[PDB]
Amino acid sequence: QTYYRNITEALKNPQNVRILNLSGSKLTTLPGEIGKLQNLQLLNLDDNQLIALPKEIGKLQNLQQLHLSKNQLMALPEEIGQLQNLQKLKLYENQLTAIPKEIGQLQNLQELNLAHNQLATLPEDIEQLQRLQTLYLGHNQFNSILKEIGQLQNLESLGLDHNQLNVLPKEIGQLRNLESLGLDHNQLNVLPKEIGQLQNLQILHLRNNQLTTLPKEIGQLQNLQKLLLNKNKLTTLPKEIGQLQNLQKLKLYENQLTTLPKEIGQLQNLQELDLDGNQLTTLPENIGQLQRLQTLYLGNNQLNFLPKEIGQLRNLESLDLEHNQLNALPKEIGKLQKLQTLNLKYNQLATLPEEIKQLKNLKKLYLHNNPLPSEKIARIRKLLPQCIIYF
Ligand SMILES: [Ca+2]
Ligand SMILES: [Zn+2]
Ligand SMILES: [Zn+2]
Ligand SMILES: [Zn+2]
Ligand SMILES: [Zn+2]
Ligand SMILES: [Zn+2]
């Protein structure tokens, strides 16, 4: 027997215990005799009522994973640094206000989850975690993040969402292996120019911040695939945004954009462009160069017209133009052979181009709240028999 769910049973046969699972057992205290389980590799203490840990936890020299999530931990003992084989430390949902400097001794640590605690600082000794690949600090009380974070050469994922960050340290740009950066729901008013140094960054979550502009250096993110900028205060995009050749998803929902740079057409790999809730008055002709675009959301903008180049979007499957002020659709709309959904609700369309009959793959057409004559729509229903027309 190597798997145990009971500490009393585990203590009768020590040197055999490899996994000790005590999750959801209303455990109020971990007995000091835990140190006797010399061959323990995984200790699961999740979903319990632990307020502290015994100093003897440091004796678990073979421990590779320590799961301590969803407890009421007020502090970690200095002896936590003695866990020289520890690769994963999970402490999400606790009441930690500090992390001991001895955390820097955990030279084998690959993953550290400190999300949902009450941390405002980290010891500078965090810079010694040169094997750390994943660091979660979301839902804490960081008003600022120490520049020593930028020293984590092997870091691939950094979670800093739901903190109180106004600014990022310029040293963040030294995370050359970073692939995912989570900054949702902070109060970021600006991004450092050094953000562009994150050459391996694939995913950047910046939703629900207070950004007004993006630095020109944002274009240096050569590996970026997903850029989530929902619910910020962007009034413009830098022309350098067009240098993001690997970008697949650009989410700009609920910003204050009035125009798009012509360089938007350079986004070779863009599949999804969400501009819902902006204040666009026009689209550049360059929009037609987005040959991989599948989804285009333009709801609640102020568009009066669409460029004829919209018809060049050969891979477009979904087009949302709800609640704009469109007076007409270009005849080129008929070239959208892959289009399946077209939402034209709440516009001022008094007519539709005859070329709409060429949309053989259209499945759903939303026309409610347009001054369209009923005879014209009845005729379109017979021209697109496979389409459901909501009018
Ligand atoms: Ca990876
Ligand atoms: Zn995120
Ligand atoms: Zn949030
Ligand atoms: Zn909308
Ligand atoms: Zn309205
Ligand atoms: Zn209605």
Query: What are residue 250's DSSP bridge partners?
Result: 227, 273
Nearest to 161 by CA among 118, 128, 194, 206: 206
Q: Which ligand is nearest to the CA of 391?
A: 6
346: left (phi over 0), alpha (psi -120 to 50) or beta: left
Residue with tokens 């180049």: 309
Ligand 2 geometric centre to CA of 123 (Å): 24
Straight-line distance from the first to the last Cα atom of the chain, in angstroms, rounded to the nearest whole number = 68
Is there a contact between 220 and 242 (Cβ–Cβ < 8 Å)?
no
CA 89/CA 97 separation, integer angstroms: 17
Q: Which ligand is nearest to the CA of 185?
A: 3
Q: What type of residue is 92?
A: Y
277: left (phi over 0), alpha (psi -120 to 50) or beta: left
**Method by which the coordinates were obtained:** X-ray
Question: Which domains, from first to last, does the chain contain?
Answer: 1-391 (3.80.10.10)
Phi, psi at 66, each rounded to 5° = -125, 110
Report the 3 state secondary structure along the chain: CCEECCHHHHHHCCCCCCEEECCCCCCCCCCHHHHHCCCCCEEECCCCCCCCCCHHHHHCCCCCEEECCCCCCCCCCHHHHHCCCCCEEECCCCCCCCCCHHHHHCCCCCEEECCCCCCCCCCHHHHHCCCCCEEECCCCCCCCCCHHHHHCCCCCEEECCCCCCCCCCHHHHHCCCCCEEECCCCCCCCCCHHHHHCCCCCEEECCCCCCCCCCHHHHHCCCCCEEECCCCCCCCCCHHHHHCCCCCEEECCCCCCCCCCHHHHHCCCCCEEECCCCCCCCCCHHHHHCCCCCEEECCCCCCCCCCHHHHHCCCCCEEECCCCCCCCCCHHHHHCCCCCEEECCCCCCCCCCHHHHHCCCCCEEECCCCCCCHHHHHHHHHHCCCCEEEC
Residues 6+ apart with CB under 8 A from 107: 84, 128, 129, 130, 131
Listed resolution, Å = 2.0
**Binding-site residue ranges for Ca(2+):** 156, 179
CA 137/CA 182 separation, integer angstroms: 10
116: left (phi over 0), alpha (psi -120 to 50) or beta: left
Nearest to 177 by CA among 195, 157, 192: 157
Give the total residue count for the chain: 391
Ligand 2 geometric centre to CA of 204 (Å): 8
CA 92/CA 87 separation, integer angstroms: 16
Ligand 6 geometric centre to CA of 369 (Å): 7
**Binding-site residue ranges for Zn(2+):** 46, 67, 93, 116, 162, 184-185, 205, 276, 323, 368
55: left (phi over 0), alpha (psi -120 to 50) or beta: alpha
Ligand 2 geometric centre to CA of 183 (Å): 6
Q: Give buried/exposed letters for 124-139 (b at 16+ CB in 10 A, else e).
A: ebbbbbeebbbbbbbb
Residues 6+ apart with CB under 8 A from 56: 32, 33, 34, 35, 79
**Binding-site residue ranges:** 46, 67, 93, 116, 156, 162, 179, 184-185, 205, 276, 323, 368
